[PDB]
């Protein structure tokens, strides 16, 4: 229930990425992925590098695109 205690969902305003309720109030829910979200925690390894280099290794080593070796995703 996004527009709860209101008249229900009117439509998705994609210019702001938000739902509009049946009154004149903007909803708190998102309906597009291009909406302003305060993202602070992101998953995956080789972050703040070029990403995971897609070669397949005989060992369990994970290498980033800039030559760095990620010890967290590397198997011991």
């Amino acid at each position: 229930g996004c527009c709860s205690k209101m008249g229900g969902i009117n439509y998705c305003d994609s210019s702001a990425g938000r739902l509009v309720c049946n009154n004149g109030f903007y909803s708190t829910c998102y309906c597009t992925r291009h909406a302003v979200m305060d993202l602070q925690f992101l998953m995956g390894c080789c972050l703040w590098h070029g990403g995971v280099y897609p070669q397949l290794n005989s060992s369990g080593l994970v290498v980033c695109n800039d030559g760095y070796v990620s010890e967290e995703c590397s198997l011991q």
């Binding site: 302003v36 979200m37 305060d38 993202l39 602070q40 972050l47 070029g50 990403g51 695109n65």
Partner: protein
């Protein structure tokens, strides 16, 4: 020798047309578009890119920025004085 002036694909990035032969990338968390052509990302947005660093930049008349940079799965941006992150998929 004189260094090169710019890359001419950034005018089409500013207009919003993707470069030919490129492929689309999925951007979440903010209003931005990205494309990958020659192992380089081309980003069209009106935010300010803070952390990863870019290679070339252009600006339009209405305040839209076009960036040329290396590929990275995360962008650090400033929205209205607040620092947040954008996620890039499809690399």
């Amino acid at each position: 020798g004189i260094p090169p002036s710019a890359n001419d694909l950034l005018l089409h990035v500013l207009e919003g047309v993707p470069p030919p032969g490129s492929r689309r990338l999925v951007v979440s968390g903010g209003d931005a578009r990205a494309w990958l052509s020659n192992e380089k990302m081309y980003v069209r947005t009106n935010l300010t890119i803070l952390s990863p660093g870019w290679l070339a930049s252009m600006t339009s008349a209405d305040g839209t920025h076009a960036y040329e940079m290396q590929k990275s799965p995360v962008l650090l941006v400033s929205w209205h004085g607040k620092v947040m992150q954008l996620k890039v998929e499809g690399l």
